[PDB]
Ligand binder design. Structure first.
Ligand SMILES: [Zn+2]
Length: 87
């Protein structure tokens, strides 16, 4: 699940009702595990479910799994710090 294309392919059977797009999930390192709306990050193995309207996957990534190596490398410690309430 190291590549964007491999993560995107797992969303081929992603439910239509979920108000979060596969493109944005896969960019933030998530892939659909083929269960409800459960996704896991390829890097930290952080699991996320119950995706609501207006959810930004990068924000959810930094909110619940701030120590993820991929999240830090892509978004940076400053972004992670902000999401954790540190300005
Ligand atoms: Zn992660």
């Amino acid at each position: 699940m190291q590549t964007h294309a491999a993560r995107m392919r797992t969303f081929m059977y992603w439910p239509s009702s979920v108000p979060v797009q596969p493109e944005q999930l896969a960019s933030a390192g998530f892939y659909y595990v083929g269960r409800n709306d459960d996704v896991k990050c390829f890097c930290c193995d952080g699991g996320l479910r119950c995706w609501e309207s207006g959810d930004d996957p990068w924000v959810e990534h930094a909110k619940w799994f701030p120590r993820c190596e991929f999240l830090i490398r892509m978004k940076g410690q400053e972004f992670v710090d902000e999401i954790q309430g540190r300005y």
